[PDB]
Amino acid sequence: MVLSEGEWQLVLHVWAKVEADVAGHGQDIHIRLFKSHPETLEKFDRFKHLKTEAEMKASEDLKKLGVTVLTALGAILKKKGHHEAELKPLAQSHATKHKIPIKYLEFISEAIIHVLHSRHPGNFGADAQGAMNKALELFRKDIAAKYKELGYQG
Numbered sequence: 001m002v003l004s005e006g007e008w009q010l011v012l013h014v015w016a017k018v019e020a021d022v023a024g025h026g027q028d029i030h031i032r033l034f035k036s037h038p039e040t041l042e043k044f045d046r047f048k049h050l051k052t053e054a055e056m057k058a059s060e061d062l063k064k065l066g067v068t069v070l071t072a073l074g075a076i077l078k079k080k081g082h083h084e085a086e087l088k089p090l091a092q093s094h095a096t097k098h099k100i101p102i103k104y105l106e107f108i109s110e111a112i113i114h115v116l117h118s119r120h121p122g123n124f125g126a127d128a129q130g131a132m133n134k135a136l137e138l139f140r141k142d143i144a145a146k147y148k149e150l151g152y153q154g
């Protein structure tokens, strides 16, 4: 798939707002993911024990991880589809070290969309949401293709 420049503009415009508070957005997104799909929390040996949202908010390690995640995703989005180099190490660790199924990448995409809709309604109307969804679908499609080449595809 290919996004138009107008669609990229909508994506980078709301992302610029997210970048005003990377740590906060990182936390909201992960808490949303863990509360909505608890099975995803099992993949983090480091955080598996967290029982409540209060404990999640209090975790400094979880906050650090959220920043790392959003920083990596932001770097990919800013490439506007030319993200081959950035995708390789990400696909390798998630397929072979962490073993993260494509399904879980769809769950976090839902969490990202939920949080942006909630925090940035004025910059996340229907058109902007469609553009972000398209960007994340492109990301998942390319990651899935890489998973297959790496021998995991799941």
Ligand code: HEM
Pocket: 040, 041, 043, 044, 045, 046, 065, 068, 069, 070, 072, 073, 089, 090, 093, 094, 098, 100, 104, 105, 108
């Ligand atoms: C927007 C999608 C995602 C991005 C950009 C992302 C990015 C990263 C990055 C950059 C790291 C650190 C270096 C590395 O190991 O590659 C990381 C670690 C990790 N990721 Fe992801 N990730 C994503 C989604 C997921 C999902 C959905 C899961 C699990 C449900 C997951 C589980 C892990 C685990 C277990 C680690 C190691 C955490 C630790 O150090 O304790 N990732 N991820």
